[PDB]
Write a protein that binds this ligand. Structure first.
Ligand SMILES: *Cc1c(COP(=O)(O)O)cnc(C)c1O
Ligand SMILES: *Cc1c(COP(=O)(O)O)cnc(C)c1O
Lengths: 429, 429
């Protein structure tokens, strides 16, 4: 608690920035970055296996993002989509709609964040249908605004379901059929046509990076469509190439009615999008708008991200580098009993820590200590999960094979030195 | 409705972007910009007296914003304030707190938009106090999200008051004392201590650019403080040098408890801020957070805006160029009877149009036609107001004396040729 520490960048953050928006696990204080590496005020370098919770899709200082943002700042097509059309925003909407199977029928709404986008999707669908009921999952993370929290699991007529977890199956049913049956029984108890939409994550993020059982999401989508319920796929976390296909729903044998994007869409700038049927997004005007929505600098960044996914073959990169990561982690699991489950798709990877592999008892304290030690060793990653025991890895898609190796090595050391981290120091955060 | 028009940038915007977030008055379609001028796809240049609703504080392609954003993109301090401190965000918070009279007691929360910021302020104050009641004004524009609309005038325990307008005074009382008296009588009817906060705009934006009567806001603030009600000053529209003082409340003889900033703070990037007492912003953690909040590119832009306000003496510029604008408009009022009132401070200017100066009957249809004709002539401005009859001028602070002249000349022509605009063409929007 001395003056030198209080005067460093982390101490100044405490004195100037309120705690309201902080989610802090260790005293990471960044002054710069390059590739998949962060540089602290003191000059210390770290590998960022978080990639800013997935937002730094192209890592730090990617030349495509430099080029686009500098170009747009020097010759910006205004500042907004609200009261003018602008070139970069329109080009972006065109590209996003062309990427999606509903390209002939769908349009785009632009926001600043995943929270904003999920709020707008819910508001538009309820307006369009005149119904407010909504299905979502327990543990779902759809945002942290009043409008997006109304159907988060982490609104009038909310039905919340368990998300089927192959490692901890609801009703001991590894197929997830018991969750579908539960949904049917819930729907039987409400008036016909009273549910407007279903929000789903195709890999549950904050819930624990939980890939649902084979077939489950297709079946779920079929139940929704049988009731005329719009299926909204929240791909803020696992979209745009991260899963090893461009859209994560490509792994799951269905196409949603509405696709929600964010995080890495902006490559480190604030950008989100909803791709929805024209009838949904055209049901009102001047209805869900913020002044800087569709600003050209952020639109330019989104174009750069899409262009770079193509130019650097990042779908295939994510699939290759995800296999490499998972190989490394499987080697770690030979040596460290704490590792209970390694899961995910592409470069959305979760590692669940347990005190015993038979019982699967969660290792909550151990996880928090692990990530603190990793920070000390020069690797940044966080945890998530209902039980606080799932390491989250969402590195930049451009992270090199060498940086994947180094991160795995640093993680190996963290696991070895877990214990060394004091309870008091960790409970500060 | 032919293919060439449908294939131009405005037509493509209609086919790809939903109407949900649009607020369109004429078919403005922008491909670039420089200074205070926009360039359409077809190459036509326009003077932007809107400045993107106030957001383009430094105009288009300002070198300070180019330099900052390019620098931060090339060496970004991560992407977020949530799970790391970062250098530009901390420096920004420091500068914002130093600018405010509550510098010893206050901290900062960062958002993407004015809507986000107003939502966060309301959530924090209600959490901190355990009270949800709130005072706001009829006609108030605090945002367009579920959380910011809950106390907009354009929440449980909402008291809404008339905003005192010198041109149309409530109860024929030009001082606004009747509105204060009404407030006292409303407060007498609620339980002691049940109102947490009062949101006010120091010039009402969407309401009609309405500068309140001398003394009113100081008196209002005193009533609030007598009841322990936190005073929140929403300066999203008229803050940061636009009024000819750095903070608009400087004209009004009070200091708020909480200051909300947005729009031009980012100079065309999405950035907002709340400056509030530490006890308010420290009352929770992980409570009001979005992944890209405090990202360094947007923080860098905000630093550039603050630095440029200083380096280019933009407070004094706004006061000088606002006098020049108001002189020009006063000349227009000699010739065009429609002009009923010219008001505002600095470069936040409103011109209210009336069918007759004695009766003050609003000229709603005429206003819409006027701005459409102006667009055709090469000037961009919009209207606002309860009666749809207030031209809004919020140009970039860097707009030159020559561009002010040209805009006034183009407006003179618009007024002359109002009639020429067809009802059908204008009612399309
Ligand atoms: C991150 C995330 C959001 C929210 O995005 P923000 O930018 O934090 O508002 C929504 N949905 C999912 C699945 C997410 O991972
Ligand atoms: C523009 C404005 C807002 C909302 O800002 P957005 O960026 O559109 O969310 C809030 N308050 C006032 C006074 C405004 O002018």
């Amino acid at each position: 608690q001395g003056p030198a520490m209080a005067g460093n960048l982390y101490g100044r953050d405490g004195a100037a920035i309120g705690s309201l928006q902080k989610l802090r696990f260790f005293p990471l204080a960044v002054a710069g970055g390059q590739g998949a590496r962060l540089v602290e005020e003191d000059g210390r370098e770290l590998i960022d296996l978080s990639g800013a919770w997935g937002a730094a899709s192209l890592g730090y200082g990617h030349p495509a993002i430099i080029e686009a943002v500098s170009r747009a700042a020097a010759n910006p097509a205004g500042a907004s989509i609200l009261s003018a059309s602008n070139a970069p925003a329109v080009a972006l909407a065109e590209r996003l709609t062309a990427s999606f199977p509903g390209r002939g029928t769908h349009k785009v709404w632009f926001g600043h964040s995943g929270s904003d986008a999920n709020e707008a999707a819910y508001r538009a669908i309820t307006r369009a249908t005149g119904r407010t009921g909504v299905i979502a999952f327990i543990g779902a993370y759809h945002g942290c605004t009043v409008g997006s929290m109304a159907f988060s699991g982490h609104a009038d007529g909310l039905i919340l379901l368990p998300y089927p977890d192959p490692y901890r199956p609801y009703q001991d049913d590894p197929t997830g059929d018991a969750v579908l049956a539960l949904l049917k029984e819930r729907l039987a108890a409400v008036p016909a046509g009273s549910i407007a939409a279903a929000f789903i994550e195709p890999i549950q993020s904050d819930g624990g990076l939980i890939v649902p059982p084979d077939g489950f999401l297709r079946k779920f989508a079929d139940i929704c469509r049988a009731h005329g319920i719009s299926v909204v796929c929240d791909e803020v976390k696992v979209g745009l190439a991260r899963s090893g296909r461009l859209h994560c729903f490509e792994h799951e044998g269905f196409v949603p009615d509405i696709l929600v994007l964010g995080k890495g869409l902006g490559g480190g700038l604030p950008l989100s999008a909803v791709i929805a049927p024209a009838e949904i997004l055209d049901c009102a005007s001047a209805f869900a708008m913020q002044t800087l929505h569709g600003n050209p600098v952020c639109a330019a960044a989104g174009l750069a991200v899409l262009e770079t996914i193509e130019a650097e073959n990042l779908t295939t990169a994510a699939e290759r580098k995800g296999k490499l990561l998972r190989e490394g982690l499987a080697r770690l699991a030979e040596r460290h009993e704490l590792i209970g489950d390694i899961r995910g798709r592409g470069l959305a990877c979760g590692v669940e820590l347990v005190r015993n592999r038979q019982s699967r008892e969660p290792a909550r304290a151990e996880t928090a200590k692990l990530i603190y030690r990793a920070y000390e060793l020069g690797l940044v990653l966080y945890y998530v999960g209902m039980n606080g025991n799932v390491l989250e890895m969402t590195p930049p898609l451009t992270m090199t094979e060498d940086e994947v190796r180094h991160a795995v090595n640093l993680l190996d050391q963290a696991f070895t030195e877990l214990s060394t981290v004091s309870d008091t120091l960790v409970s500060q955060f």
